[PDB]
Amino acid sequence: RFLKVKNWETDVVLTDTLHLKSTLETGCTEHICMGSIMLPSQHTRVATKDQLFPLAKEFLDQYYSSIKRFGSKAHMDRLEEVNKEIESTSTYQLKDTELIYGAKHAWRNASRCVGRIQWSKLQVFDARDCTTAHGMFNYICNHVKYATNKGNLRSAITIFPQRTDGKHDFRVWNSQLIRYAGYKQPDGSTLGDPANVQFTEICIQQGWKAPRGRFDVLPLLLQANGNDPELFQIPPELVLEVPIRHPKFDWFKDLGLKWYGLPAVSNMLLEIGGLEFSACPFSGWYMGTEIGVRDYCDNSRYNILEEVAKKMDLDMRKTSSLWKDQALVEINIAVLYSFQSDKVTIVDHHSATESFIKHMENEYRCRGGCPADWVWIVPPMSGSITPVFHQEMLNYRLTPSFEYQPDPWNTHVWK
Amino acid sequence: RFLKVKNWETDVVLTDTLHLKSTLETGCTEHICMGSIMLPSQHTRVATKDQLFPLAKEFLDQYYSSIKRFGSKAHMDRLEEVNKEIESTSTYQLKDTELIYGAKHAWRNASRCVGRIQWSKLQVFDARDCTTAHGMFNYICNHVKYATNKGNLRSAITIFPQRTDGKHDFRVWNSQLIRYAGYKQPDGSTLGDPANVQFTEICIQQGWKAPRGRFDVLPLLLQANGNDPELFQIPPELVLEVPIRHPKFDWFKDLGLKWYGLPAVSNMLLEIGGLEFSACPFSGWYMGTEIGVRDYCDNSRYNILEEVAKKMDLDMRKTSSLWKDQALVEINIAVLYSFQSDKVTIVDHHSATESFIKHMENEYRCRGGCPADWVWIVPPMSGSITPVFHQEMLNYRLTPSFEYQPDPWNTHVWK
Numbered sequence A, B: 001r002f003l004k005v006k007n008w009e010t011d012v013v014l015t016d017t018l019h020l021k022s023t024l025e026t027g028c029t030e031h032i033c034m035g036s037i038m039l040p041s042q043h044t045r046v047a048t049k050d051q052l053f054p055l056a057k058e059f060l061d062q063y064y065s066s067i068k069r070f071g072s073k074a075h076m077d078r079l080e081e082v083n084k085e086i087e088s089t090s091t092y093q094l095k096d097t098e099l100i101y102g103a104k105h106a107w108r109n110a111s112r113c114v115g116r117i118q119w120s121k122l123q124v125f126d127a128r129d130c131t132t133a134h135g136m137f138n139y140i141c142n143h144v145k146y147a148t149n150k151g152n153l154r155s156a157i158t159i160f161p162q163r164t165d166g167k168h169d170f171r172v173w174n175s176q177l178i179r180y181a182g183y184k185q186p187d188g189s190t191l192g193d194p195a196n197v198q199f200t201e202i203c204i205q206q207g208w209k210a211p212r213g214r215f216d217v218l219p220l221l222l223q224a225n226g227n228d229p230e231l232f233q234i235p236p237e238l239v240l241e242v243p244i245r246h247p248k249f250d251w252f253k254d255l256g257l258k259w260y261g262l263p264a265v266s267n268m269l270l271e272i273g274g275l276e277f278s279a280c281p282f283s284g285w286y287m288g289t290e291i292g293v294r295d296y297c298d299n300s301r302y303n304i305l306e307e308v309a310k311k312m313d314l315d316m317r318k319t320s321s322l323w324k325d326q327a328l329v330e331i332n333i334a335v336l337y338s339f340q341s342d343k344v345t346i347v348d349h350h351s352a353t354e355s356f357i358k359h360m361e362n363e364y365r366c367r368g369g370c371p372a373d374w375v376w377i378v379p380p381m382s383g384s385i386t387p388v389f390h391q392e393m394l395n396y397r398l399t400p401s402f403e404y405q406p407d408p409w410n411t412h413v414w415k
């Protein structure tokens, strides 16, 4: 009841008691582990008034434990107050301070997030007064501007009104506020980002005039209070982009690559005290490998290890020449170099993973544990030369949390 | 009750029913996943006559199902026969054919093993007639010779007598039949393999005269039927070694690296029909990354990314120059190149991981599933440019199996 995780590179041993507070299930049973299923049925998201008070009570008891005033009158009053409001309205509302705590701790509890050392320094924009897609677009634009901070990126989340009935639902339909378009070709090949082609067509469906290149920033599709979503173009001056050059290969400019500075995940669901915020875009800054490895080099993403290795003049005949590995390291040197030379906040997968081990030490000391998904924490290149490879991580689901949710067009009852 | 695993790079979907046959537990519960604990208490190994027949019956019912003659008289007789022998002797003995099946399927069931596409082509040397450390040493030498096959490596396992009481126990004390010695220094640094220093001293304890270099092949320490283990030097002509050169950097010879051709894991436990074979060395051929990444570049292993990157003339000031990544790809190009140019069987982590996906297809088709540990199947470099990164794997514990077991010197009641 007091589990142990070891680092096999440092012989460090931490003791995890925090998992005792754990609430939701994982997908693993005693006789099967599913630690590598991408979107388990547990990580995906309609609740009633009955279940809503335990979740409200549980969340509130830890929020007052957080600000050192647990069990007091201001606590016991706030429990009655929300109890009373959940009888009266079969839902309730979070105090501005309860939102900021809740959100911060959904990030803190994200076991698949390697950059959580910064969880406390999160900026919460309370957009619960929003009512229109235009209001969303305005809130989202001020997010983009603030979090971008001219390359000196800042963590932020903008929280649109919580789900109520379920049919009046705020959603960003984008998977990220900034993503490049994806267009299929005559021969069935793909220009742009193959991940988004389904979304790119949904935008053209609703009227997007596509410039039909690679790195075309998509418009925002914003569903407000259940109504049909509406296209909005982020002002280009607000979308900061790093053109990718290499600090050796001058032909790497002619590759003509670039990425947006701001990773800002928009399509997920924030759970606080049993309340569901269906739109809650959040942003940080990139780890280099998300762009250099996954975006640029996944097979069904930009798939550039081909053209890069060509220009490197690499033994591409044999699989065992490791030409794919060689061209991958250069591509990530270029991403990190490019972002740093434009003063745009980026972190390499070595620095990010050491900070996470430093963060894990804090969380097992001043909190008793740190839920961690090794399958997701280990960078997708040079796994074992980074210190997270050798660290055992206990994965469990705490709340407040971020949950996946179905894409809106699979569920949205249209006009 | 018919779980689904998806490949997110190919959209391939397999259906796992084989996990229904699963028997032992994993360490994960509904509310915690431990898929990244190295040696869970389940994966580590005294049984009574009561429990011994279900395990005997379960194993035999699948062995006759294997050779198409399930439920027949030869089956029902063999069940009575072993039932009778487990009453009479509170243990039993495997037919030569039941050993070969059992062993092959312990390899087949090893969910952490990426090279299992070859599980059926395993050579089983039945050393259950062995009684002395000298007999062990002779059996082990014929293993080494056979599996090495002059660089054209072959899979093999040598099975010493099964555990009985528990105090008469055959054990190879080596973790592998061939490993380099590790000696600590005046300044506390380490010459050789830091992993083995504890073992290297136990050998010098029992009388090993150490040549005190790096790549000094350790002697065998062989415990036979419970008696004190005894040192034996594998004839050097039997220990094939690849000196590591690079196909560009002529200063990579002057690095002076070399590795043994034969990976041969000796310290683990083979479970067949509830029977425990405490000594069962098994060997295949290397994946390149086990040497180039883990051996050569783990921090507490040979830790050569230092000296290699120096000679590469690399930006070692900044962590974010990715100099560690750059020097790692070259080191693995050199290992693969070196082994191939000496006609010594080696596989690159790209070829090995594609074969495993091909193998996974066979196992979900002609068997209903394939237990797989993603944390261990994904190569420790260039994770996501290999197809196992994107494949969901169901991990479960089938039997016959290989289990870890405590090291003998922590348990051996000495003389």
Ligand code: HEM
Residues within 6 Å of the ligand: A043, A106, A107, A110, A111, A112, A113, A114, A115, A116, A118, A122, A155, A156, A157, A282, A283, A284, A285, A286, A287, A290, A347, A352, A376, A402
């Ligand atoms: C501050 C810089 C940040 C960095 C470097 C970072 C890095 C990462 C990385 C590399 C992943 C793995 C996902 C992938 O590779 O596709 C991830 C996942 C995630 N991060 Fe962070 N992130 C940051 C900020 C944030 C913020 C501000 C939040 C929430 C407000 C957050 C919450 C999450 C969540 C929910 C996931 C996915 C967990 C899941 O899929 O279940 N992160 N992050």
Ligand code: HEM
Residues within 6 Å of the ligand: B043, B106, B107, B110, B111, B112, B113, B114, B115, B116, B118, B122, B155, B156, B157, B282, B283, B284, B285, B286, B287, B290, B347, B352, B376, B402
């Ligand atoms: C034929 C070539 C083979 C290759 C390329 C191969 C490769 C690997 C690799 C890369 C690992 C991960 C361990 C690590 O990286 O430290 C592993 C684990 C393992 N392999 Fe294989 N192997 C081969 C043959 C065999 C054979 C012949 C057996 C059994 C007779 C076997 C059974 C296992 C077991 C039991 C494990 C570890 C599972 C655990 O720790 O629970 N493998 N193998």
Ligand SMILES: Cc1cc(N)nc(COc2cc(CCN(C)C)cc(F)c2F)c1
Residues within 6 Å of the ligand: A038, A115, A263, A264, A265, A268, A282, A283, A284, A285, A286, A287, A290
């Ligand atoms: C704020 C932030 C910063 C950063 N540097 N990186 C990220 C990446 O975050 C996520 C990535 C995915 C991709 C999931 N895949 C199946 C497509 C799903 C999520 F839910 C995430 F939160 C986020």
Ligand SMILES: Cc1cc(N)nc(COc2cc(CCN(C)C)cc(F)c2F)c1
Residues within 6 Å of the ligand: B038, B115, B263, B264, B265, B268, B282, B283, B284, B285, B286, B287, B290
């Ligand atoms: C036959 C074979 C071929 C091959 N190419 N590689 C291997 C590696 O197999 C193992 C490696 C370890 C290291 C475990 N670590 C904690 C030190 C533990 C085991 F039980 C293994 F079976 C085996």
Ligand SMILES: C[C@H](O)[C@H](O)[C@H]1CNc2nc(N)[nH]c(=O)c2N1
Residues within 6 Å of the ligand: A036, A037, A038, A375, A376, A377, A378, B008, B389, B390, B391, B392, B393
């Ligand atoms: C199949 C597997 O779950 C899937 O590829 C996961 C593995 N680990 C990951 N880890 C991170 N950080 N990001 C990912 O997208 C994935 N994908």
Ligand SMILES: C[C@H](O)[C@H](O)[C@H]1CNc2nc(N)[nH]c(=O)c2N1
Residues within 6 Å of the ligand: A008, A389, A390, A391, A392, A393, B036, B037, B038, B375, B376, B377, B378
């Ligand atoms: C902590 C973690 O379980 C440990 O480092 C594991 C991770 N995955 C691995 N995978 C392989 N193939 N070999 C290993 O030694 C390990 N080590």
Ligand SMILES: [Zn+2]
Residues within 6 Å of the ligand: A028, A032, A033, A034, A035, B028, B032, B033, B034, B035
């Ligand atoms: Zn699990």
